[PDB]
Ligand binder design. Structure first.
Ligand SMILES: *CC[C@H](NCc1c(COP(=O)(O)O)cnc(C)c1O)C(=O)O
Ligand SMILES: *CC[C@H](NCc1c(COP(=O)(O)O)cnc(C)c1O)C(=O)O
Ligand SMILES: [K+]
Ligand code: NI
Ligand code: NI
Ligand code: NI
Ligand code: NI
Lengths: 417, 417
């Protein structure tokens, strides 16, 4: 084959499938708390669909448009869907910001949109700065086929894993050291795996740093609609609304996490740079969104009654579900980073480490997966600077199963501590 | 931006949108005969859908499976859909060959599957051999992000644009000359833009050549279901059915052309090499097929009554439509390559060239688009070795519009010749 053709986050995931938990067929199975999915609000969608069958019937205004959709492969995207998307994104941001649909580019999921953005701004050998801890999938998405390098901006629990001027300069000094040409910074807001919204000061800090370095800022806002608690979610685009730096600020979105439709593969890129758009637009040809899905979500995201109620009901259920995990953890004497967003909790299990090393982290992880039968993501998998932290997903399973996981966890700790 | 971020086939296409033809709003518009789309058999699908609403209703065996689909993002693909796909591909090949679903990899269209295959077999700087003329989109799909080079295997009208032992060695000698490492040959069977099925002798010739060079063979069989006339379509996989070369034979498929659903973005890769599959599989994450589309086509492609009737009715309508273009052309004294497949005719307009040059070809093309108001693909756009040839699509428009195009063409020739 070729070079391109030739961790724990992916292993635990594969182990889960080798022996998945089932409330009837396999009660001693592995419980999956390692995938950030949101299955809480399906009933609201399932209900709406069964009563609004026209979208799925390839019909518009009553008349069939099956032929038009079957042929639609325009890499510019279905216009009705792009408008519905930019309004939904505006609604999530309290309508404090507005997006132009001619500047929105659809992609098959955010996995496809992040890689695409890398291909547009960084040539092989070049580099991007990314705050750690970060989504484990980034190592694959952003590097495998682009040949670009990620230089970590380290963050510690000292200041709640926030981004500091110190970390930024330090990460950039590491780039210059390795003679790597830094093309930009890619941040996740709200943060995965932290489950925290970025503060306005962090945002201004990023905007200033990339203004002094003449580089790009990419904000992965896929969890923007999962901000179920104060403070408020602040889009990087809102911070620009209060010279030439805005042409270097970009947004990556997806309907995978707030709507819980990762299977439909709807992602997007939004940039103010007319050039980035045109190039990203052309690249979407490699991963367009099914026109069938575009038309369906175009009808759903157009029902302002459905979206207003969905957002409010999702925040509510997320918050309730989050407290149930926190309390379940507090029950075993385990604390979490104070999070107000995401579909997971960044958990502090340092006090359970044999030693302050990653080797010890690994060991604790193995036991949890092979003994407690729970799949969670270790912090080294997220490139966290300090051992002991784990990401635990709480919205990808039934409440009762969540309780079960907690019990198996309480037993374990009260079984070795 | 970056290097990656920074012809006539694409221009004529853009001109068409700047002034598209319309049988009511714009009769002097440009007629599109440059896009190989099949709108002939939509009625059969549209009809089936309106009477089998469950697929589009996210329901299986009566029960809702909306939640399961919404969450399905497995890069291994929905199993029911993969089985339905491998049987449909088997049916198109007269069930003379069988495909294993664990060896089939889904991608968002064949555009996504061809690039992916390039990333798996060729490292940047390396090369692939491709018979000309070939699909203009290949220059973008296979080279833009892979950095791989295409070395043309020239074919002339002398022997009906078939592939000869001479052309193969010659193309390979050109590679060695440019110190390019040849990784394989990528062929289109049936051929685009020729609209001809590959003969068994050509297939054996390719299998032998790649066996002597120790390289891979990729067969783009996206038009396999558009073989509406004798001789029969012969899959490269059938030729292998009558030592270690089969592990280097691969197939690229799509539902864009036989089913006429380019908008749904369903593509696939099939290889016998367990290693290629696993790697292609991982790469599909960048362009997965919407689970909604997978489930819909899983029901449709499972109705053996629908598929048997669709295939037979499609061949029939294609053949009838093809003769209508040939006769329309013969009417202006224009001949075509004797084609038995595809959604287009490879037309000989050499006798209309001011001179035997491409400059003259360009000139004839400009006039046709700007004067006759017809969009067709010139042969240089396909990297044809001899000027004067044009690809004309006949299945992407209403019969009456097709007649109109013919009239405007007859007038033109009888207006300058
Ligand atoms: C649901 C997986 C979750 N996060 C994934 C993810 C993506 C991929 O999303 P998609 O749109 O479905 O391709 C892109 N960006 C980020 C920042 C994340 O987290 C997880 O398990 O972490
Ligand atoms: C319908 C366009 C037609 N051929 C396209 C094409 C593709 C892309 O197909 P998709 O599956 O929709 O991404 C891939 N391979 C080949 C060989 C062709 O021709 C055209 O206008 O030529
Ligand atoms: K897709
Ligand atoms: Ni367009
Ligand atoms: Ni603009
Ligand atoms: Ni899988
Ligand atoms: Ni096998």
């Amino acid at each position: 084959l070729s070079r391109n053709a030739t961790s724990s986050y992916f292993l635990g995931w594969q182990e889960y499938e080798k022996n998945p938990y089932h409330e009837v067929h396999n009660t001693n199975g592995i419980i999956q708390m390692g995938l950030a999915e949101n299955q809480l609000c399906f009933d609201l969608l399932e209900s709406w669909l069964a009563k609004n069958p026209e979208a799925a019937a390839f019909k518009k205004n009553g008349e069939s448009i099956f032929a038009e959709l079957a042929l639609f492969q325009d890499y510019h995207g279905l216009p009705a869907f792009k408008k519905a998307m930019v309004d939904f994104m505006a609604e999530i941001r309290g309508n404090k910001v507005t997006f132009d649909p001619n500047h929105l580019v659809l992609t098959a999921g955010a996995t496809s949109a992040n890689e695409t953005f890398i291909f547009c701004l960084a040539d092989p050998g070049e580099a991007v700065l990314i705050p750690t801890p970060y989504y484990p999938g980034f190592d694959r998405d952003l590097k495998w086929r682009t040949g670009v390098e990620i230089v970590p901006i380290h963050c510690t629990s000292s200041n709640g894993f926030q981004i500091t001027e110190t970390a930024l300069e330090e990460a950039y000094q590491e780039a210059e050291k390795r003679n790597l040409r830094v093309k930009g910074v890619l941040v996740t807001n709200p943060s995965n795996p932290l489950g925290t919204t970025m503060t306005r000061n962090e945002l201004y800090l990023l905007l200033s740093f990339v203004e002094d370095k003449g580089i790009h800022l990419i904000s992965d806002e896929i969890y923007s609609g999962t901000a179920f608690s104060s403070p408020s979610f602040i889009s990087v685009m809102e911070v620009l609304k209060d010279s030439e730096v805005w042409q270097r600020v970009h947004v990556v979105y997806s309907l995978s996490k707030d709507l819980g439709l990762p299977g439909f593969r709807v992602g997007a890129i939004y940039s103010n740079d007319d050039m980035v758009v045109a190039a990203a637009t052309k690249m979407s040809s490699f991963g367009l969104v099914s026109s069938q899905t575009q038309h369906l979500l175009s009808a759903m995201l157009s029902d302002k009654k459905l979206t207003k109620n969905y957002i409010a009901e999702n925040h509510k259920r997320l918050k309730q579900r989050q407290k149930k995990l926190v309390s379940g953890l507090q029950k075993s004497g385990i604390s979490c980073l104070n999070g107000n967003a995401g579909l997971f909790c960044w958990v502090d299990m340092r006090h359970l480490l044999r030693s302050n090393t990653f080797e010890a982290e690994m060991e604790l992880w193995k036991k949890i997966v092979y003994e407690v039968h729970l799949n969670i993501s270790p912090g080294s998998s997220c490139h966290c600077t300090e051992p002991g932290w784990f990401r635990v997903c709480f919205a990808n399973l039934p409440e009762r199963t969540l309780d079960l996981a907690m019990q198996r966890l309480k037993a374990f700790v009260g079984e070795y501590y």
